Design a protein around this motif. Structure first.
Motif, mmCIF file in Angstrom:
data_model
loop_
_atom_site.group_PDB
_atom_site.id
_atom_site.type_symbol
_atom_site.label_atom_id
_atom_site.label_comp_id
_atom_site.label_asym_id
_atom_site.label_seq_id
_atom_site.Cartn_x
_atom_site.Cartn_y
_atom_site.Cartn_z
ATOM 1 N N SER A 1 -0.278 -2.930 -1.793
ATOM 2 C CA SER A 1 0.482 -1.846 -2.408
ATOM 3 C C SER A 1 0.410 -0.575 -1.570
ATOM 4 N N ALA A 2 -0.734 -0.325 -0.933
ATOM 5 C CA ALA A 2 -0.878 0.868 -0.108
ATOM 6 C C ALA A 2 -0.062 0.759 1.171
ATOM 7 N N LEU B 1 2.758 -0.884 1.330
ATOM 8 C CA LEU B 1 4.110 -0.609 0.854
ATOM 9 C C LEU B 1 4.336 0.889 0.667
ATOM 10 N N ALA B 2 3.350 1.590 0.105
ATOM 11 C CA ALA B 2 3.483 3.028 -0.103
ATOM 12 C C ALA B 2 3.577 3.779 1.218
ATOM 13 N N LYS C 1 7.019 3.291 2.558
ATOM 14 C CA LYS C 1 7.953 4.157 1.844
ATOM 15 C C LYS C 1 7.836 5.602 2.314
ATOM 16 N N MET C 2 6.608 6.091 2.492
ATOM 17 C CA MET C 2 6.418 7.473 2.920
ATOM 18 C C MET C 2 6.993 7.705 4.309
#
Lengths: 49, 50
Positions: free
Chosen positions: A36-37, A39-40, A43-44
Protein backbone atom coordinates in the motif's frame (compact mmCIF):
# COMPACT_ATOMS: atom_id res chain seq x y z
CA UNK A 1 13.54 -28.68 39.56
CA UNK A 2 13.49 -32.26 38.19
CA UNK A 3 9.68 -32.27 37.97
CA UNK A 4 9.21 -28.53 37.39
CA UNK A 5 11.33 -28.76 34.24
CA UNK A 6 8.48 -30.51 32.40
CA UNK A 7 5.94 -27.82 33.31
CA UNK A 8 8.39 -25.07 32.34
CA UNK A 9 8.96 -26.90 29.05
CA UNK A 10 5.22 -26.97 28.33
CA UNK A 11 4.91 -23.26 29.10
CA UNK A 12 7.96 -22.47 26.95
CA UNK A 13 6.50 -24.41 24.02
CA UNK A 14 3.18 -22.59 24.29
CA UNK A 15 4.73 -19.14 24.56
CA UNK A 16 7.12 -19.86 21.68
CA UNK A 17 4.24 -20.93 19.45
CA UNK A 18 2.33 -17.77 20.37
CA UNK A 19 5.33 -15.57 19.58
CA UNK A 20 5.91 -17.34 16.26
CA UNK A 21 2.27 -16.82 15.29
CA UNK A 22 2.46 -13.13 16.18
CA UNK A 23 5.69 -12.67 14.22
CA UNK A 24 4.28 -14.37 11.12
CA UNK A 25 1.09 -12.29 11.24
CA UNK A 26 3.16 -9.13 11.63
CA UNK A 27 5.30 -10.11 8.64
CA UNK A 28 2.26 -10.64 6.42
CA UNK A 29 0.55 -7.43 7.55
CA UNK A 30 3.78 -5.48 7.05
CA UNK A 31 4.06 -6.86 3.52
CA UNK A 32 0.52 -5.65 2.81
CA UNK A 33 1.33 -2.24 4.29
CA UNK A 34 4.49 -2.05 2.18
CA UNK A 35 2.46 -2.74 -0.96
CA UNK A 36 0.00 0.00 0.00
CA UNK A 37 2.88 2.38 0.72
CA UNK A 38 4.45 1.69 -2.67
CA UNK A 39 1.08 2.48 -4.25
CA UNK A 40 0.87 5.69 -2.21
CA UNK A 41 4.38 6.74 -3.26
CA UNK A 42 3.50 6.06 -6.90
CA UNK A 43 0.38 8.20 -6.52
CA UNK A 44 2.35 11.01 -4.86
CA UNK A 45 5.01 11.03 -7.57
CA UNK A 46 2.67 10.64 -10.56
CA UNK A 47 -0.14 12.95 -9.39
CA UNK A 48 1.25 15.74 -7.20
CA UNK A 49 4.41 16.20 -9.28
CA UNK B 1 34.07 -44.13 34.62
CA UNK B 2 33.60 -44.05 38.40
CA UNK B 3 32.65 -46.66 41.00
CA UNK B 4 31.05 -45.45 44.24
CA UNK B 5 30.57 -48.28 46.74
CA UNK B 6 28.63 -48.04 50.00
CA UNK B 7 26.14 -49.94 52.16
CA UNK B 8 22.51 -48.80 52.47
CA UNK B 9 19.23 -50.35 53.54
CA UNK B 10 16.90 -51.94 51.02
CA UNK B 11 14.26 -49.31 51.82
CA UNK B 12 16.52 -46.43 50.75
CA UNK B 13 17.49 -48.10 47.45
CA UNK B 14 14.97 -45.94 45.59
CA UNK B 15 16.71 -42.86 47.02
CA UNK B 16 19.75 -43.53 44.78
CA UNK B 17 18.24 -42.11 41.58
CA UNK B 18 18.14 -38.74 39.78
CA UNK B 19 15.31 -36.49 40.87
CA UNK B 20 13.57 -37.66 44.04
CA UNK B 21 15.05 -36.64 47.39
CA UNK B 22 15.11 -37.85 50.98
CA UNK B 23 17.17 -37.92 54.14
CA UNK B 24 19.69 -40.30 52.57
CA UNK B 25 19.91 -38.36 49.29
CA UNK B 26 20.06 -34.92 50.90
CA UNK B 27 23.19 -34.93 53.09
CA UNK B 28 24.90 -38.26 52.30
CA UNK B 29 24.86 -39.01 48.55
CA UNK B 30 22.90 -37.21 45.83
CA UNK B 31 22.76 -38.00 42.09
CA UNK B 32 22.86 -35.34 39.35
CA UNK B 33 19.66 -34.67 37.42
CA UNK B 34 21.29 -35.57 34.07
CA UNK B 35 23.25 -38.50 35.50
CA UNK B 36 24.72 -40.89 32.93
CA UNK B 37 25.53 -44.38 34.13
CA UNK B 38 23.92 -47.21 36.06
CA UNK B 39 23.07 -47.98 39.68
CA UNK B 40 23.94 -51.52 40.81
CA UNK B 41 22.58 -52.91 44.08
CA UNK B 42 22.49 -56.42 45.52
CA UNK B 43 21.46 -58.13 48.75
CA UNK B 44 24.30 -58.62 51.25
CA UNK B 45 22.69 -59.93 54.43
CA UNK B 46 25.38 -62.63 54.63
CA UNK B 47 28.37 -60.26 54.71
CA UNK B 48 27.57 -57.04 56.60
CA UNK B 49 24.87 -58.19 59.05
CA UNK B 50 26.94 -58.90 62.17
Amino acid sequence: PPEAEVQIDRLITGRLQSLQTYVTQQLIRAAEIRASANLAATKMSECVL
Amino acid sequence: VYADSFVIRGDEVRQIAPGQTGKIADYNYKLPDDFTGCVIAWNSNNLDSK
